[PDB]
Design a protein around this ligand. Structure first.
Ligand code: CLA
Ligand code: CLA
Ligand code: CLA
Ligand code: CLA
Ligand SMILES: CCCCCCCCCCCCCCCC(=O)OC[C@H](COP(=O)(O)OC[C@@H](O)CO)OC(=O)CCCCCCCCCCCCCCC
Ligand SMILES: CC1=C(/C=C/C(C)=C/C=C/C(C)=C/C=C/C=C(C)/C=C/C=C(C)/C=C/C2=C(C)CCCC2(C)C)C(C)(C)CCC1
Ligand SMILES: CC1=C(/C=C/C(C)=C/C=C/C(C)=C/C=C/C=C(C)/C=C/C=C(C)/C=C/C2=C(C)CCCC2(C)C)C(C)(C)CCC1
Lengths: 57, 122
Protein backbone atom coordinates (compact mmCIF):
# COMPACT_ATOMS: atom_id res chain seq x y z
CA UNK A 1 0.00 0.00 0.00
CA UNK A 2 1.04 3.54 0.80
CA UNK A 3 4.64 4.03 1.96
CA UNK A 4 5.04 5.74 5.34
CA UNK A 5 5.90 9.16 3.88
CA UNK A 6 2.64 9.29 1.93
CA UNK A 7 0.03 8.29 4.57
CA UNK A 8 -1.50 11.78 4.65
CA UNK A 9 -2.11 11.76 0.88
CA UNK A 10 -5.45 10.03 1.58
CA UNK A 11 -6.76 13.52 2.35
CA UNK A 12 -6.09 14.93 -1.11
CA UNK A 13 -9.55 14.26 -2.52
CA UNK A 14 -11.39 14.37 0.83
CA UNK A 15 -12.10 18.00 1.80
CA UNK A 16 -14.08 17.18 4.94
CA UNK A 17 -11.22 15.04 6.24
CA UNK A 18 -8.70 17.66 5.15
CA UNK A 19 -10.66 20.18 7.25
CA UNK A 20 -10.62 17.61 10.09
CA UNK A 21 -6.83 17.20 9.82
CA UNK A 22 -6.37 20.97 9.70
CA UNK A 23 -8.63 21.40 12.73
CA UNK A 24 -6.58 18.81 14.63
CA UNK A 25 -3.40 20.70 13.70
CA UNK A 26 -4.94 23.99 14.89
CA UNK A 27 -6.06 22.23 18.09
CA UNK A 28 -2.50 21.03 18.74
CA UNK A 29 -0.93 24.43 18.01
CA UNK A 30 -3.45 26.24 20.22
CA UNK A 31 -2.90 23.62 22.92
CA UNK A 32 0.84 24.14 22.59
CA UNK A 33 0.43 27.90 23.06
CA UNK A 34 -1.67 27.44 26.20
CA UNK A 35 0.54 24.76 27.75
CA UNK A 36 3.68 26.75 26.92
CA UNK A 37 2.22 29.90 28.46
CA UNK A 38 1.32 27.92 31.61
CA UNK A 39 4.77 26.33 31.86
CA UNK A 40 6.32 29.79 31.56
CA UNK A 41 3.98 31.26 34.22
CA UNK A 42 4.91 28.36 36.51
CA UNK A 43 8.61 29.15 35.98
CA UNK A 44 8.71 32.94 35.57
CA UNK A 45 10.10 35.06 38.41
CA UNK A 46 8.47 38.51 37.95
CA UNK A 47 10.08 40.16 40.97
CA UNK A 48 12.93 41.98 39.16
CA UNK A 49 12.18 43.51 35.75
CA UNK A 50 15.57 45.27 35.84
CA UNK A 51 18.25 42.58 36.23
CA UNK A 52 16.02 39.50 35.83
CA UNK A 53 13.61 40.30 32.97
CA UNK A 54 11.76 37.71 30.90
CA UNK A 55 14.56 37.44 28.31
CA UNK A 56 17.06 36.33 30.96
CA UNK A 57 14.62 33.62 32.09
CA UNK B 1 -31.90 53.32 66.98
CA UNK B 2 -28.92 51.78 68.81
CA UNK B 3 -28.28 48.34 67.33
CA UNK B 4 -28.43 44.94 69.02
CA UNK B 5 -26.55 41.74 68.31
CA UNK B 6 -29.26 40.41 66.01
CA UNK B 7 -28.98 43.49 63.79
CA UNK B 8 -25.18 43.31 63.81
CA UNK B 9 -24.53 39.58 63.36
CA UNK B 10 -23.26 38.55 59.92
CA UNK B 11 -23.21 42.11 58.54
CA UNK B 12 -19.56 42.93 59.19
CA UNK B 13 -20.40 45.98 61.34
CA UNK B 14 -18.91 44.21 64.39
CA UNK B 15 -15.45 44.66 62.82
CA UNK B 16 -15.91 48.45 62.49
CA UNK B 17 -14.82 51.15 64.91
CA UNK B 18 -17.71 53.44 65.92
CA UNK B 19 -17.86 56.80 64.19
CA UNK B 20 -18.71 60.40 65.05
CA UNK B 21 -20.98 62.83 63.23
CA UNK B 22 -19.30 65.66 61.32
CA UNK B 23 -20.66 68.20 63.84
CA UNK B 24 -18.26 66.88 66.51
CA UNK B 25 -15.40 69.30 65.90
CA UNK B 26 -15.27 70.05 69.63
CA UNK B 27 -12.64 69.86 72.35
CA UNK B 28 -12.41 67.80 75.53
CA UNK B 29 -11.03 69.89 78.43
CA UNK B 30 -8.45 67.92 80.37
CA UNK B 31 -8.55 69.06 83.98
CA UNK B 32 -4.89 68.70 85.04
CA UNK B 33 -5.87 67.46 88.54
CA UNK B 34 -8.47 64.84 87.63
CA UNK B 35 -7.75 61.20 86.77
CA UNK B 36 -9.03 60.18 83.32
CA UNK B 37 -9.44 56.77 81.72
CA UNK B 38 -9.93 55.31 78.25
CA UNK B 39 -13.08 53.24 78.53
CA UNK B 40 -12.85 51.78 75.02
CA UNK B 41 -10.21 52.20 72.34
CA UNK B 42 -10.97 50.60 68.97
CA UNK B 43 -8.51 50.37 66.06
CA UNK B 44 -9.94 49.34 62.70
CA UNK B 45 -7.20 48.77 60.10
CA UNK B 46 -8.14 49.72 56.58
CA UNK B 47 -4.81 49.28 54.76
CA UNK B 48 -1.91 46.90 55.24
CA UNK B 49 1.31 47.75 53.41
CA UNK B 50 4.36 45.50 53.30
CA UNK B 51 7.91 46.59 52.52
CA UNK B 52 9.53 44.68 49.69
CA UNK B 53 13.01 43.17 49.87
CA UNK B 54 15.18 44.27 46.93
CA UNK B 55 18.06 41.84 46.46
CA UNK B 56 20.56 44.61 45.67
CA UNK B 57 21.01 46.36 49.05
CA UNK B 58 19.91 49.57 47.28
CA UNK B 59 16.75 50.31 45.19
CA UNK B 60 13.51 51.89 46.44
CA UNK B 61 12.37 49.77 49.41
CA UNK B 62 8.77 50.85 49.00
CA UNK B 63 5.70 49.72 50.90
CA UNK B 64 3.47 47.75 48.54
CA UNK B 65 -0.29 47.16 48.96
CA UNK B 66 -1.59 43.76 49.92
CA UNK B 67 -4.93 41.93 49.88
CA UNK B 68 -6.40 40.71 53.15
CA UNK B 69 -7.22 36.99 53.09
CA UNK B 70 -8.35 36.39 56.69
CA UNK B 71 -11.65 38.29 56.35
CA UNK B 72 -13.24 40.79 58.80
CA UNK B 73 -11.20 39.61 61.80
CA UNK B 74 -8.87 42.58 61.99
CA UNK B 75 -9.99 45.18 64.52
CA UNK B 76 -8.72 45.66 68.04
CA UNK B 77 -11.50 46.68 70.38
CA UNK B 78 -12.48 47.14 74.02
CA UNK B 79 -8.98 48.31 74.96
CA UNK B 80 -8.82 50.12 78.31
CA UNK B 81 -6.21 51.84 80.41
CA UNK B 82 -5.30 54.89 82.42
CA UNK B 83 -4.80 58.23 80.69
CA UNK B 84 -2.28 59.91 82.99
CA UNK B 85 -1.98 63.68 82.77
CA UNK B 86 1.73 64.41 83.11
CA UNK B 87 3.66 67.41 84.47
CA UNK B 88 3.59 69.38 81.21
CA UNK B 89 -0.06 68.73 80.41
CA UNK B 90 0.90 65.94 78.05
CA UNK B 91 -1.39 62.93 78.31
CA UNK B 92 0.15 59.47 78.30
CA UNK B 93 -2.01 56.42 77.55
CA UNK B 94 -0.92 53.24 79.28
CA UNK B 95 -2.61 50.23 77.70
CA UNK B 96 -3.94 47.84 80.31
CA UNK B 97 -6.25 45.24 78.81
CA UNK B 98 -8.60 44.34 75.98
CA UNK B 99 -8.71 42.60 72.62
CA UNK B 100 -5.37 44.12 71.70
CA UNK B 101 -4.07 41.76 69.02
CA UNK B 102 -5.38 40.03 65.91
CA UNK B 103 -3.44 37.65 63.68
CA UNK B 104 -3.73 38.95 60.14
CA UNK B 105 -2.59 37.39 56.89
CA UNK B 106 -2.17 39.51 53.80
CA UNK B 107 -1.09 38.38 50.37
CA UNK B 108 1.37 40.12 48.06
CA UNK B 109 1.52 40.19 44.28
CA UNK B 110 2.64 36.69 43.34
CA UNK B 111 0.89 34.85 46.17
CA UNK B 112 3.23 35.29 49.15
CA UNK B 113 1.04 35.19 52.26
CA UNK B 114 2.38 37.52 54.94
CA UNK B 115 1.17 36.69 58.47
CA UNK B 116 1.41 39.35 61.14
CA UNK B 117 0.24 39.75 64.72
CA UNK B 118 -1.47 43.12 64.40
CA UNK B 119 -1.26 44.42 67.92
CA UNK B 120 -1.00 47.34 70.29
CA UNK B 121 0.14 45.22 73.24
CA UNK B 122 1.57 47.28 76.13
C1 CLA C 1 -1.12 17.18 13.36
C2 CLA C 1 -0.75 15.91 13.35
C3 CLA C 1 -1.43 14.84 12.59
C4 CLA C 1 -2.79 14.70 12.03
C5 CLA C 1 -3.95 15.65 12.03
C6 CLA C 1 -2.68 13.35 11.40
C7 CLA C 1 -3.79 12.72 10.71
C8 CLA C 1 -3.86 11.50 10.18
N1 CLA C 1 -2.92 10.56 10.18
MG1 CLA C 1 -0.95 10.97 10.67
N2 CLA C 1 0.84 10.99 11.68
C9 CLA C 1 1.29 12.01 12.39
C10 CLA C 1 0.60 13.27 12.63
C11 CLA C 1 -0.77 13.56 12.23
N3 CLA C 1 -1.53 12.73 11.56
C12 CLA C 1 2.64 11.81 12.98
C13 CLA C 1 3.47 12.70 13.83
C14 CLA C 1 2.98 10.46 12.54
C15 CLA C 1 4.24 9.70 12.81
C16 CLA C 1 4.08 8.93 14.10
C17 CLA C 1 1.80 10.06 11.76
C18 CLA C 1 1.82 8.73 11.13
C19 CLA C 1 0.65 8.18 10.53
C20 CLA C 1 0.51 6.80 10.07
C21 CLA C 1 1.42 5.64 9.99
C22 CLA C 1 -0.86 6.85 9.57
C23 CLA C 1 -1.32 8.11 9.81
C24 CLA C 1 -2.71 8.25 9.38
C25 CLA C 1 -3.43 9.55 9.57
C26 CLA C 1 -4.88 9.69 9.24
C27 CLA C 1 -5.72 8.89 10.25
C28 CLA C 1 -5.42 8.95 11.75
C29 CLA C 1 -4.28 8.07 12.23
O1 CLA C 1 -4.27 6.86 12.07
O2 CLA C 1 -3.11 8.67 12.82
C30 CLA C 1 -2.21 7.90 13.60
C31 CLA C 1 -1.95 8.74 14.84
C32 CLA C 1 -0.73 9.06 15.26
C33 CLA C 1 0.46 8.52 14.55
C34 CLA C 1 -0.55 9.90 16.49
C35 CLA C 1 0.89 10.16 16.90
C36 CLA C 1 1.05 9.94 18.38
C37 CLA C 1 2.11 10.84 18.97
C38 CLA C 1 3.18 10.01 19.68
C39 CLA C 1 1.45 11.78 19.95
C40 CLA C 1 0.72 11.05 21.07
C41 CLA C 1 0.18 12.06 22.08
C42 CLA C 1 0.79 11.83 23.45
C43 CLA C 1 -0.30 11.88 24.52
C44 CLA C 1 1.89 12.86 23.71
C45 CLA C 1 3.21 12.21 24.14
C46 CLA C 1 4.17 13.24 24.72
C47 CLA C 1 5.55 12.65 25.00
C48 CLA C 1 6.55 13.73 25.39
C49 CLA C 1 5.49 11.56 26.07
C50 CLA C 1 -5.18 11.13 9.58
C51 CLA C 1 -5.37 11.79 8.23
C52 CLA C 1 -3.12 6.93 8.85
C53 CLA C 1 -3.61 6.91 7.45
O3 CLA C 1 -4.73 7.23 7.19
O4 CLA C 1 -2.75 6.46 6.41
C54 CLA C 1 -3.25 6.18 5.12
C55 CLA C 1 -1.96 6.05 8.99
O5 CLA C 1 -1.86 4.86 8.63
N4 CLA C 1 -0.47 9.00 10.38
C1 CLA D 1 2.39 23.31 5.33
C2 CLA D 1 3.34 22.44 5.28
C3 CLA D 1 3.27 21.14 4.59
C4 CLA D 1 2.13 20.25 4.31
C5 CLA D 1 0.69 20.37 4.62
C6 CLA D 1 2.76 19.10 3.63
C7 CLA D 1 1.98 17.96 3.17
C8 CLA D 1 2.42 16.84 2.59
N1 CLA D 1 3.69 16.56 2.28
MG1 CLA D 1 5.24 17.95 2.41
N2 CLA D 1 6.94 19.02 2.85
C9 CLA D 1 6.92 20.14 3.57
C10 CLA D 1 5.76 20.89 4.04
C11 CLA D 1 4.41 20.39 4.00
N3 CLA D 1 4.06 19.22 3.47
C12 CLA D 1 8.24 20.62 3.98
C13 CLA D 1 8.60 21.82 4.76
C14 CLA D 1 9.14 19.63 3.41
C15 CLA D 1 10.62 19.63 3.48
C16 CLA D 1 10.94 19.01 4.80
C17 CLA D 1 8.23 18.70 2.74
C18 CLA D 1 8.84 17.57 2.08
C19 CLA D 1 8.00 16.48 1.65
C20 CLA D 1 8.51 15.27 0.97
C21 CLA D 1 9.87 14.78 0.58
C22 CLA D 1 7.23 14.55 0.80
C23 CLA D 1 6.24 15.36 1.31
C24 CLA D 1 4.92 14.75 1.21
C25 CLA D 1 3.68 15.43 1.70
C26 CLA D 1 2.33 14.74 1.62
C27 CLA D 1 2.23 13.52 2.56
C28 CLA D 1 2.78 13.74 3.97
C29 CLA D 1 2.86 12.50 4.81
O1 CLA D 1 2.09 11.59 4.71
O2 CLA D 1 3.94 12.40 5.74
C30 CLA D 1 3.92 11.44 6.75
C31 CLA D 1 4.98 11.81 7.75
C32 CLA D 1 5.23 11.04 8.80
C33 CLA D 1 4.45 9.78 9.01
C34 CLA D 1 6.30 11.40 9.79
C35 CLA D 1 7.23 12.57 9.49
C36 CLA D 1 7.89 12.97 10.81
C37 CLA D 1 8.89 14.10 10.69
C38 CLA D 1 10.02 13.66 9.77
C39 CLA D 1 9.44 14.49 12.06
C40 CLA D 1 8.37 14.81 13.09
C41 CLA D 1 7.57 16.06 12.78
C42 CLA D 1 6.91 16.60 14.04
C43 CLA D 1 5.95 15.56 14.61
C44 CLA D 1 6.15 17.87 13.76
C45 CLA D 1 7.02 19.10 13.52
C46 CLA D 1 6.23 20.18 12.83
C47 CLA D 1 7.15 21.35 12.56
C48 CLA D 1 6.63 22.28 11.49
C49 CLA D 1 7.42 22.08 13.85
C50 CLA D 1 1.41 15.80 2.20
C51 CLA D 1 0.64 16.40 1.03
C52 CLA D 1 5.15 13.44 0.53
C53 CLA D 1 4.48 13.44 -0.78
O3 CLA D 1 4.62 14.34 -1.54
O4 CLA D 1 3.64 12.34 -1.14
C54 CLA D 1 3.29 12.08 -2.48
C55 CLA D 1 6.60 13.32 0.31
O5 CLA D 1 7.20 12.37 -0.26
N4 CLA D 1 6.61 16.54 1.85
C1 CLA E 1 -17.57 32.72 3.73
C2 CLA E 1 -17.51 31.58 4.36
C3 CLA E 1 -16.22 31.08 4.88
C4 CLA E 1 -15.50 31.40 6.13
C5 CLA E 1 -15.88 32.34 7.23
C6 CLA E 1 -14.28 30.54 5.99
C7 CLA E 1 -13.25 30.44 7.03
C8 CLA E 1 -12.30 29.53 7.16
N1 CLA E 1 -12.03 28.52 6.35
MG1 CLA E 1 -12.85 28.36 4.45
N2 CLA E 1 -14.00 27.69 2.87
C9 CLA E 1 -15.11 28.28 2.45
C10 CLA E 1 -15.71 29.50 2.96
C11 CLA E 1 -15.36 30.08 4.23
N3 CLA E 1 -14.25 29.78 4.92
C12 CLA E 1 -15.78 27.61 1.32
C13 CLA E 1 -17.04 28.02 0.66
C14 CLA E 1 -14.93 26.46 1.04
C15 CLA E 1 -15.10 25.38 0.02
C16 CLA E 1 -15.89 24.27 0.68
C17 CLA E 1 -13.88 26.61 2.06
C18 CLA E 1 -12.82 25.60 2.07
C19 CLA E 1 -11.93 25.51 3.22
C20 CLA E 1 -11.00 24.41 3.50
C21 CLA E 1 -10.67 23.15 2.79
C22 CLA E 1 -10.42 24.90 4.77
C23 CLA E 1 -10.97 26.14 5.02
C24 CLA E 1 -10.47 26.69 6.29
C25 CLA E 1 -11.00 27.96 6.87
C26 CLA E 1 -10.53 28.50 8.21
C27 CLA E 1 -9.05 28.91 8.33
C28 CLA E 1 -8.75 29.75 9.57
C29 CLA E 1 -8.85 29.01 10.89
O1 CLA E 1 -8.97 27.82 10.97
O2 CLA E 1 -8.78 29.79 12.11
C30 CLA E 1 -8.78 29.24 13.42
C31 CLA E 1 -10.15 29.28 14.02
C32 CLA E 1 -10.60 30.17 14.92
C33 CLA E 1 -9.83 31.32 15.47
C34 CLA E 1 -12.02 30.02 15.38
C35 CLA E 1 -12.93 29.91 14.19
C36 CLA E 1 -14.09 30.87 14.21
C37 CLA E 1 -15.14 30.30 13.30
C38 CLA E 1 -15.80 31.37 12.43
C39 CLA E 1 -16.14 29.52 14.14
C40 CLA E 1 -16.84 28.47 13.30
C41 CLA E 1 -18.33 28.40 13.63
C42 CLA E 1 -19.13 28.13 12.38
C43 CLA E 1 -20.60 28.18 12.79
C44 CLA E 1 -18.74 26.79 11.79
C45 CLA E 1 -18.44 26.72 10.30
C46 CLA E 1 -17.57 27.85 9.80
C47 CLA E 1 -17.29 27.78 8.31
C48 CLA E 1 -18.11 28.74 7.48
C49 CLA E 1 -15.81 28.09 8.15
C50 CLA E 1 -11.47 29.67 8.38
C51 CLA E 1 -12.39 29.31 9.52
C52 CLA E 1 -9.48 25.72 6.80
C53 CLA E 1 -9.83 25.14 8.13
O3 CLA E 1 -10.93 24.70 8.33
O4 CLA E 1 -8.81 25.12 9.13
C54 CLA E 1 -8.93 24.40 10.36
C55 CLA E 1 -9.46 24.62 5.85
O5 CLA E 1 -8.72 23.61 5.92
N4 CLA E 1 -11.91 26.58 4.14
C1 CLA F 1 3.96 28.33 10.32
C2 CLA F 1 3.79 27.38 11.22
C3 CLA F 1 3.66 25.94 10.92
C4 CLA F 1 3.66 25.18 9.67
C5 CLA F 1 3.73 25.60 8.26
C6 CLA F 1 3.53 23.79 10.16
C7 CLA F 1 3.48 22.64 9.26
C8 CLA F 1 3.29 21.37 9.60
N1 CLA F 1 3.11 20.87 10.81
MG1 CLA F 1 2.84 22.06 12.51
N2 CLA F 1 3.19 23.07 14.31
C9 CLA F 1 3.37 24.39 14.44
C10 CLA F 1 3.51 25.32 13.34
C11 CLA F 1 3.54 24.91 11.95
N3 CLA F 1 3.45 23.69 11.47
C12 CLA F 1 3.42 24.89 15.83
C13 CLA F 1 3.61 26.28 16.35
C14 CLA F 1 3.25 23.65 16.60
C15 CLA F 1 3.22 23.41 18.08
C16 CLA F 1 4.63 23.08 18.50
C17 CLA F 1 3.14 22.62 15.56
C18 CLA F 1 2.94 21.25 16.02
C19 CLA F 1 2.84 20.16 15.07
C20 CLA F 1 2.65 18.74 15.43
C21 CLA F 1 2.49 17.96 16.67
C22 CLA F 1 2.61 18.17 14.07
C23 CLA F 1 2.74 19.19 13.17
C24 CLA F 1 2.77 18.69 11.80
C25 CLA F 1 2.95 19.62 10.64
C26 CLA F 1 3.04 19.12 9.22
C27 CLA F 1 1.71 18.58 8.71
C28 CLA F 1 1.65 18.12 7.27
C29 CLA F 1 2.35 16.82 7.01
O1 CLA F 1 1.78 15.76 6.96
O2 CLA F 1 3.77 16.91 6.78
C30 CLA F 1 4.60 15.78 6.63
C31 CLA F 1 5.81 16.06 7.49
C32 CLA F 1 6.80 16.80 7.03
C33 CLA F 1 6.79 17.35 5.66
C34 CLA F 1 8.00 17.05 7.88
C35 CLA F 1 8.21 18.49 8.25
C36 CLA F 1 9.52 18.57 9.00
C37 CLA F 1 9.60 19.89 9.76
C38 CLA F 1 9.65 21.03 8.78
C39 CLA F 1 10.78 20.00 10.71
C40 CLA F 1 11.84 18.94 10.58
C41 CLA F 1 11.79 18.08 11.83
C42 CLA F 1 12.94 17.09 11.96
C43 CLA F 1 12.82 15.95 10.94
C44 CLA F 1 12.98 16.54 13.38
C45 CLA F 1 12.83 17.61 14.46
C46 CLA F 1 13.30 17.16 15.84
C47 CLA F 1 12.47 16.02 16.43
C48 CLA F 1 13.09 15.50 17.73
C49 CLA F 1 11.02 16.44 16.64
C50 CLA F 1 3.31 20.40 8.47
C51 CLA F 1 4.74 20.34 7.96
C52 CLA F 1 2.53 17.22 11.89
C53 CLA F 1 3.41 16.28 11.16
O3 CLA F 1 4.51 16.59 10.84
O4 CLA F 1 2.89 14.95 10.92
C54 CLA F 1 3.70 13.97 10.29
C55 CLA F 1 2.49 16.93 13.32
O5 CLA F 1 2.33 15.79 13.80
N4 CLA F 1 2.89 20.44 13.70
C1 LIG G 1 4.86 14.02 17.82
C2 LIG G 1 5.21 12.73 17.11
C3 LIG G 1 6.64 12.59 16.72
C4 LIG G 1 6.76 11.26 16.03
C5 LIG G 1 7.82 11.37 14.99
C6 LIG G 1 8.09 10.05 14.35
C7 LIG G 1 9.27 10.09 13.45
C8 LIG G 1 9.08 9.16 12.30
C9 LIG G 1 10.35 8.44 11.93
C10 LIG G 1 10.68 8.33 10.48
C11 LIG G 1 11.95 7.54 10.22
C12 LIG G 1 11.90 7.11 8.81
C13 LIG G 1 13.03 6.28 8.30
C14 LIG G 1 12.40 5.48 7.16
C15 LIG G 1 13.33 4.47 6.51
C16 LIG G 1 12.80 3.76 5.31
O1 LIG G 1 11.63 3.48 5.29
O2 LIG G 1 13.53 3.85 4.19
C17 LIG G 1 13.18 3.12 3.02
C18 LIG G 1 12.24 3.99 2.18
C19 LIG G 1 12.02 3.30 0.87
O3 LIG G 1 10.66 3.14 0.78
P1 LIG G 1 10.03 2.72 -0.63
O4 LIG G 1 9.55 3.92 -1.28
O5 LIG G 1 10.88 1.60 -1.09
O6 LIG G 1 8.72 2.02 -0.02
C20 LIG G 1 8.81 0.88 0.79
C21 LIG G 1 7.70 1.18 1.80
O7 LIG G 1 7.47 -0.02 2.48
C22 LIG G 1 8.01 2.29 2.78
O8 LIG G 1 6.91 2.49 3.63
O9 LIG G 1 12.84 5.22 1.82
C23 LIG G 1 12.56 6.30 2.58
O10 LIG G 1 12.01 6.24 3.64
C24 LIG G 1 13.44 7.42 2.15
C25 LIG G 1 14.35 7.85 3.25
C26 LIG G 1 15.47 6.83 3.45
C27 LIG G 1 15.97 7.15 4.81
C28 LIG G 1 16.73 5.99 5.39
C29 LIG G 1 18.13 6.03 4.92
C30 LIG G 1 18.98 5.02 5.64
C31 LIG G 1 20.35 5.60 5.75
C32 LIG G 1 21.04 5.10 7.00
C33 LIG G 1 21.79 6.24 7.67
C34 LIG G 1 22.52 5.71 8.86
C35 LIG G 1 23.92 5.23 8.66
C36 LIG G 1 24.75 6.51 8.63
C37 LIG G 1 26.21 6.20 8.93
C38 LIG G 1 27.10 7.38 8.54
C1 LIG H 1 -11.11 18.37 25.11
C2 LIG H 1 -11.83 19.46 25.77
C3 LIG H 1 -11.25 20.38 26.55
C4 LIG H 1 -9.82 20.33 26.89
C5 LIG H 1 -8.76 20.73 26.16
C6 LIG H 1 -7.39 20.41 26.51
C7 LIG H 1 -7.06 20.15 27.93
C8 LIG H 1 -6.41 20.58 25.60
C9 LIG H 1 -4.99 20.51 25.86
C10 LIG H 1 -4.13 20.37 24.84
C11 LIG H 1 -2.69 20.51 24.96
C12 LIG H 1 -2.11 20.80 26.28
C13 LIG H 1 -1.92 20.33 23.88
C14 LIG H 1 -0.49 20.50 23.80
C15 LIG H 1 0.11 20.28 22.62
C16 LIG H 1 1.53 20.18 22.46
C17 LIG H 1 2.14 19.99 21.27
C18 LIG H 1 1.39 20.08 20.00
C19 LIG H 1 3.58 20.01 21.22
C20 LIG H 1 4.30 19.63 20.16
C21 LIG H 1 5.74 19.65 20.26
C22 LIG H 1 6.65 19.50 19.29
C23 LIG H 1 6.28 19.50 17.87
C24 LIG H 1 8.05 19.67 19.62
C25 LIG H 1 9.04 19.23 18.85
C26 LIG H 1 10.45 19.59 19.01
C27 LIG H 1 11.24 19.09 19.99
C28 LIG H 1 10.77 18.15 21.03
C29 LIG H 1 12.67 19.42 20.15
C30 LIG H 1 13.07 20.60 19.31
C31 LIG H 1 12.52 20.47 17.92
C32 LIG H 1 11.01 20.50 17.97
C33 LIG H 1 10.62 21.94 18.24
C34 LIG H 1 10.52 20.15 16.57
C35 LIG H 1 -12.11 21.44 27.16
C36 LIG H 1 -12.20 21.22 28.66
C37 LIG H 1 -11.52 22.82 27.00
C38 LIG H 1 -13.49 21.61 26.52
C39 LIG H 1 -13.79 20.82 25.28
C40 LIG H 1 -13.25 19.42 25.40
C1 LIG I 1 -17.74 14.67 25.75
C2 LIG I 1 -17.44 13.71 26.83
C3 LIG I 1 -16.19 13.46 27.22
C4 LIG I 1 -15.11 14.25 26.63
C5 LIG I 1 -13.91 13.85 26.24
C6 LIG I 1 -12.91 14.74 25.72
C7 LIG I 1 -13.30 15.50 24.52
C8 LIG I 1 -11.63 14.51 26.04
C9 LIG I 1 -10.48 14.84 25.24
C10 LIG I 1 -9.27 14.79 25.78
C11 LIG I 1 -8.05 15.39 25.27
C12 LIG I 1 -8.13 16.45 24.26
C13 LIG I 1 -6.88 15.14 25.88
C14 LIG I 1 -5.66 15.82 25.55
C15 LIG I 1 -4.47 15.41 26.03
C16 LIG I 1 -3.28 16.20 25.83
C17 LIG I 1 -2.04 15.89 26.20
C18 LIG I 1 -1.69 14.59 26.80
C19 LIG I 1 -0.99 16.89 26.05
C20 LIG I 1 0.22 16.77 26.58
C21 LIG I 1 1.14 17.88 26.49
C22 LIG I 1 2.41 17.90 26.93
C23 LIG I 1 3.24 16.68 27.03
C24 LIG I 1 2.97 19.16 27.36
C25 LIG I 1 4.26 19.45 27.29
C26 LIG I 1 4.78 20.81 27.31
C27 LIG I 1 4.69 21.65 26.27
C28 LIG I 1 4.09 21.33 24.95
C29 LIG I 1 5.17 23.05 26.25
C30 LIG I 1 5.44 23.54 27.65
C31 LIG I 1 6.25 22.50 28.37
C32 LIG I 1 5.44 21.24 28.58
C33 LIG I 1 6.46 20.20 29.02
C34 LIG I 1 4.48 21.45 29.74
C35 LIG I 1 -15.92 12.49 28.35
C36 LIG I 1 -15.29 11.18 27.91
C37 LIG I 1 -15.04 13.11 29.41
C38 LIG I 1 -17.15 12.12 29.13
C39 LIG I 1 -18.34 11.88 28.27
C40 LIG I 1 -18.65 13.03 27.35
Amino acid sequence: GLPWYRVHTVLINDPGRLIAAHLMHTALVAGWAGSMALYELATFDPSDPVLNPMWRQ
Amino acid sequence: QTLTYDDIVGTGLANKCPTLDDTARGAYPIDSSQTYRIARLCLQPTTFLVKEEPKNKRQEAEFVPTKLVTRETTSLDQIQGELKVNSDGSLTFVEEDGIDFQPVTVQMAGGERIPLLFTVKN
